[PDB]
Write a protein that holds these residues in place. Sequence first.
Motif, PDB file in Angstrom:
ATOM      1  N   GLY A   1      -0.265   5.237   6.781  1.00 37.75           N
ATOM      2  CA  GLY A   1      -0.049   5.741   5.444  1.00 37.75           C
ATOM      3  C   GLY A   1       1.379   5.663   4.942  1.00 37.75           C
TER       4      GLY A   1
ATOM      5  N   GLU B   1       1.274   8.347   9.627  1.00 36.43           N
ATOM      6  CA  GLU B   1       0.027   9.089   9.676  1.00 36.43           C
ATOM      7  C   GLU B   1      -1.122   8.095   9.616  1.00 36.43           C
ATOM      8  OE1 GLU B   1      -2.527  10.130   7.364  1.00 36.43           O
ATOM      9  OE2 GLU B   1      -1.997   8.696   5.792  1.00 36.43           O
ATOM     10  N   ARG B   2      -2.260   8.491  10.165  1.00 42.84           N
ATOM     11  CA  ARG B   2      -3.296   7.557  10.560  1.00 42.84           C
ATOM     12  C   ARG B   2      -4.479   7.607   9.603  1.00 42.84           C
ATOM     13  NH1 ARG B   2      -3.070  11.762  14.223  1.00 42.84           N
ATOM     14  NH2 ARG B   2      -1.764  10.543  15.649  1.00 42.84           N
ATOM     15  N   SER B   3      -5.167   6.468   9.482  1.00 37.97           N
ATOM     16  CA  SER B   3      -6.313   6.387   8.584  1.00 37.97           C
ATOM     17  C   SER B   3      -7.597   6.752   9.306  1.00 37.97           C
ATOM     18  CB  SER B   3      -6.424   4.986   7.994  1.00 37.97           C
ATOM     19  OG  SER B   3      -5.314   4.687   7.170  1.00 37.97           O
TER      20      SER B   3
ATOM     21  N   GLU C   1     -14.307  -1.175   4.656  1.00 39.20           N
ATOM     22  CA  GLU C   1     -14.119   0.197   4.206  1.00 39.20           C
ATOM     23  C   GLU C   1     -12.656   0.606   4.260  1.00 39.20           C
ATOM     24  OE1 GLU C   1     -16.314   2.174   2.749  1.00 39.20           O
ATOM     25  OE2 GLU C   1     -17.732   0.508   2.767  1.00 39.20           O
ATOM     26  N   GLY C   2     -11.805  -0.222   4.851  1.00 38.46           N
ATOM     27  CA  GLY C   2     -10.381   0.017   4.840  1.00 38.46           C
ATOM     28  C   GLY C   2      -9.871   0.965   5.895  1.00 38.46           C
ATOM     29  N   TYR C   3     -10.612   1.169   6.982  1.00 41.89           N
ATOM     30  CA  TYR C   3     -10.115   2.021   8.054  1.00 41.89           C
ATOM     31  C   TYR C   3      -9.099   1.287   8.917  1.00 41.89           C
ATOM     32  CZ  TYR C   3     -13.380   5.759   7.015  1.00 41.89           C
ATOM     33  OH  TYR C   3     -14.043   6.794   6.407  1.00 41.89           O
TER      34      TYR C   3
ATOM     35  N   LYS D   1      -4.141   0.520  10.049  1.00 37.71           N
ATOM     36  CA  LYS D   1      -3.649   0.850   8.721  1.00 37.71           C
ATOM     37  C   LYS D   1      -3.091   2.263   8.726  1.00 37.71           C
ATOM     38  CE  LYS D   1      -5.190   0.838   3.901  1.00 37.71           C
ATOM     39  NZ  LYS D   1      -6.355   0.582   3.013  1.00 37.71           N
TER      40      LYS D   1
ATOM     41  N   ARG E   1      -6.598   7.381   2.143  1.00 35.91           N
ATOM     42  CA  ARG E   1      -6.337   6.906   3.495  1.00 35.91           C
ATOM     43  C   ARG E   1      -6.963   5.543   3.692  1.00 35.91           C
ATOM     44  NH1 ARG E   1      -8.618  11.390   7.576  1.00 35.91           N
ATOM     45  NH2 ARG E   1     -10.179   9.730   7.333  1.00 35.91           N
ATOM     46  N   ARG E   2      -8.147   5.361   3.133  1.00 31.93           N
ATOM     47  CA  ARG E   2      -8.870   4.103   3.270  1.00 31.93           C
ATOM     48  C   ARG E   2      -8.653   3.094   2.152  1.00 31.93           C
ATOM     49  NH1 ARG E   2     -14.804   6.225   4.738  1.00 31.93           N
ATOM     50  NH2 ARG E   2     -15.471   5.002   2.915  1.00 31.93           N
ATOM     51  N   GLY E   3      -7.805   3.422   1.189  1.00 26.99           N
ATOM     52  CA  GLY E   3      -7.538   2.513   0.087  1.00 26.99           C
ATOM     53  C   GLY E   3      -8.777   2.117  -0.694  1.00 26.99           C
ATOM     54  N   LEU E   4      -9.659   3.078  -0.908  1.00 27.02           N
ATOM     55  CA  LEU E   4     -10.890   2.836  -1.637  1.00 27.02           C
ATOM     56  C   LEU E   4     -10.967   3.668  -2.901  1.00 27.02           C
ATOM     57  CD1 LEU E   4     -13.006   1.947   1.237  1.00 27.02           C
ATOM     58  CD2 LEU E   4     -14.191   1.851  -0.978  1.00 27.02           C
TER      59      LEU E   4
END
Lengths: 198, 32, 122, 130, 48
Positions: free
Chosen positions: D65, D69-71, D41-43, D63, A165-168
């Motif tokens: 998916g 759908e949600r991050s 962190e990409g949230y 961001k 989800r966070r692309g990590l």
Amino acid sequence: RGRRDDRGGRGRDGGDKSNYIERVVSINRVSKVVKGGRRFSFTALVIVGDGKGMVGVGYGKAKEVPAAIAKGVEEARKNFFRVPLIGSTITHPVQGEAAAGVVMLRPASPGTGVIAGGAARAVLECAGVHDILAKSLGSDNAINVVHATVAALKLLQRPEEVAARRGLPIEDVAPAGMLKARRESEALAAAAAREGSA
Amino acid sequence: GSVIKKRRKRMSKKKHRKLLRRTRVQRRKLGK
Amino acid sequence: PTIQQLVRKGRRDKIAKVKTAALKGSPQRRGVCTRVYTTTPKKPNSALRKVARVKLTSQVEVTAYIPGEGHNLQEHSMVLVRGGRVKDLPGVRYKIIRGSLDTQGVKNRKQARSRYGAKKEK
Amino acid sequence: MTDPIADFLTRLRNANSAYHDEVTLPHSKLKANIAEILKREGYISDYRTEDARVGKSLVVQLKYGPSRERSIAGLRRVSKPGLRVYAKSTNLPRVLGGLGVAIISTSSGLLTDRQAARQGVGGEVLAYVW
Amino acid sequence: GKIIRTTKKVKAHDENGEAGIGDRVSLMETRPLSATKRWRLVEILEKA
RNA sequence: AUCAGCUUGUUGGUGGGGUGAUGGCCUACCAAGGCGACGACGGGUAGCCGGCCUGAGAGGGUGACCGGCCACACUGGGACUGAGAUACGGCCCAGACUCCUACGGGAGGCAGCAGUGGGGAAUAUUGCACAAUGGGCGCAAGCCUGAUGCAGCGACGCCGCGUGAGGGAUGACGGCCUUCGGGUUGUAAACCUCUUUCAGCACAGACGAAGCGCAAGUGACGGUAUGUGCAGAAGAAGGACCGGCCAACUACGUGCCAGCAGCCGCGGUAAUACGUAGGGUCCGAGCGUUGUCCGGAAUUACUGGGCGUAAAGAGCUCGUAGGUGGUUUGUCGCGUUGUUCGUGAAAACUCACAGCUUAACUGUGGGCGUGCGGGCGAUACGGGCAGACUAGAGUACUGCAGGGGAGACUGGAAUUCCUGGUGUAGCGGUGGAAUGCGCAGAUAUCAGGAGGAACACCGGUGGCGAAGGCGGGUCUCUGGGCAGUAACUGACGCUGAGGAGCGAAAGCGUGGGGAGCGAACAGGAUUAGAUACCCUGGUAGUCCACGCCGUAAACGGUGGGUACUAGGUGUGGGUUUCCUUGGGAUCCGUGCCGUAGCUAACGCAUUAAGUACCCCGCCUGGGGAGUACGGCCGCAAGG
RNA sequence: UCGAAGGUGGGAUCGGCGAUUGGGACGAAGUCGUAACAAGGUAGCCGUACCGGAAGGUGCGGCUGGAUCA
């Protein structure tokens, strides 16, 4: 649920594949007033599941008890549900709510045992967990705590899913102890699996 | 909600009012 | 609620809710018994209950229930009243020990045997 | 207007719950640092800072998916005015078993829980996001 | 966990009368100089 | 706070005095403060702590043993001696009590160890030693020591061991059920080998003492512990429970009785719930009961709850303390944080290890001691100080809408009475009637007059006001709102415990007014009976002036502020772009429908009961009871 | 000079008892009615005032937790 031990010279008892784990949580006769008296029926809240961690929830309505249990079996059969784990634990502490059902499902170190009340103990004993630590806050019931526990298991997700989800790159999503537990559980999956191949 | 709660409360209130009618005089003089 | 409202004043427990007023926080009190009359309970349970009102040493006036089939105690017996609970007659929450200072244990009691105070057969 | 950051994260929970593509905010320093952490962190996907009525503004694109759908699966302000929650180094509170992260504003700036663990400094929490 | 602001009406000793109302004075603990005068103040910072 | 003010050596100063030492500790004078809604002064209870118990923890309860402090020694004062005094087994005085006295006067003081009476549900022997450790005096020997060391007593607690082991039947005797076949007790028993801890009887017999001692000896416990022997299954099991929760069921006996029960609830001649029996289950030298605490109880919710209808939003505002605070530069290092020093006695607690046949127990070494103080470092965030900014807040300017309020003057329709016409026997009233007004001239109609109150139509899901609330008109004085421009100020904001103000109707005081309506009050009717509805009359009241009172389903049953979150359609106020009044966009308002989300459900749903932040109110099962007692306000009703 | 006890004094405050009396809780079953729940037979409820053997009735204002729909 009485008089089940029987030997029949008939065609078949039709025993076959999918020997799953099935738990009947509660049965309360449900009455209905009609003109000239009461009509008693029966409700059986049926939990089915296999030890991987797939859970069903069925809800049987019939005016006989094994009929209601069998209809709950077929309804949970129709509606399964995937639960993600780590080894035989749960991933992370959650709280589930089904409108009054609060259940906190928290992981623990292995060996501790499934500590939960009887509805949550049923849903987790059918599932693939062996060592977690839950509690049922509020609503003091069976149906709302089963359905709240299944909503709580819907608030679960993989460590990997979170990383995605966070692309990590994992490592970067979990902390390290839980990655070590992934190594332990996949390692015993390799040992029992390769002992399963031979 | 229901009016039953309201009416139990009001029964108490009524009884009390009456009790102060009859003792009105007596409370004044026994107090003075 | 609005945590400074709890810093001002709030969040205390309710009330100790003391069960028995025998006195002192004492488990059983010996007592002079008077007027051992037999009563009538509430409406789903109709019988005659064998109570006796007892003046505990603790100077209070209570009314205790006498368990068992019959009571050896007459007027002015030194009965040893413990605290119990009988739902069935309102206001009687104490039980007299059977097999005690004055009131003898229940005779031919052969199964219950610790309550009702029946000594073992020789 | 009593808490700035609660209106920030509040606007991210509303704009996240209602399937939005971007969001606009009054720019400040602390919101810029939190936006930079949620970048790293990409949230969130990326933020850009505009000039607007009087002041600058913060436009965050969120961001999503492989479908809608949600991050960000939630926000929760914990170091709120009135009970500002402090944290020693022993425990930077772990969030969602570690899968969630904890925006902790130490003396070195603003860090996450993991950076507060390894670099050996604590001293706040702020909201923690999973 | 609420960071409570609390006050403390101490009593203090000026030999020279250097302070007045509203000032930012320092303090230092002394011997008990009377019945609750246990502070003397050196290097008064700001006057009113 | 159902205790809001207390204080005059009381608050500070100077000179003395006193003390081991600072000091209203004391004294003389001078000054007049000081302490209090961060709860002063009063009231109630209580030794405080390392700890103990409980708990996931946070916390709750508790302060027994052991250990550390404090206070007291028959009750209450006082000094002396001394390095040092609440001086338990000291003194002096006054009391209360016990005792001796030749009556003149004396003596006492277990809250030391035993012990006795009393009180009580309940708590032990008028023990043996200074061998060990501590203490005193003494050059030392040594002497003293109810500290201590041990012993006795009580299953009072915690731990360990025993009441045998192995063999043994298509399963005996007896018991109780039975479908009359049998089934259970039951491998259990009898029997057959074997072994004996622990009690029993024998003989040997400690360590604790690298001690003391110049004497030759010395262990209270002790002939105990412990050894090695002998005899033989030999001397050794009980208590609760078997409806549900909650492991464990059958018969007999009484059939709303006698009894049971922690709650739900079992007993009305076929009870697995009462009593007895078999049998089972759970514990075991114990097992049940009662009491007290924590838990479960997220059921006082910091961690971790709520308030539309379930308990719960003050009737509504203004505002004191308080709490909380937009954008940005600097500085301080008070909050925060990092690190090191010091400290948190021992014991306990936890981890490891050693010692006792094991364990409880005890010891050694870590950790714990979640804290506090000192030094050094960091400056994001909170704060302080010094500044800067215009988006919040307020002001100016241009308009605009409105039953906002108060005062004053006035308008007509209608009801009632009055005088006068016209004019006759009924009018009024009802489900149906009768009291009633009439025949003395009513009701009806026409003309005129008085007087009071309420404002048809416009006018409704509409406007304004903070909430109550506000509609005939006009004039006078005055309050708020909205939009537009952005001219000004530059965070002046938000909320608000107590507090002051406003607050329908009814009611209250003094003085007016009194048409209609009208409690109470009559009569009539209805009815078994109406102290009621319905009818006829009718006083306070309703009205105005001046004040009280403070309550309502004062309701959107929804505290105030702020930011955000698909829309659709009405209507109210105002700005503007486009067609050229029609749509668009915008700011403020008020309704109906509707997603997401929320809710126990109904519902809410940009006017949230949605997502979040700030402050206040309030709730903790139902009655008892918004009642008593007390206080405050009020003329009283009462709040 | 100070000063414990003692004495006199008028109060605070916490209780105990008190003839009689107010209400309250429970009892089964008694008497009297039938107020509420269906438009509960006069919609109910709130405030207040007055009255009545009792539940209650009426007035003034309010409210839907009101009904059928003129």
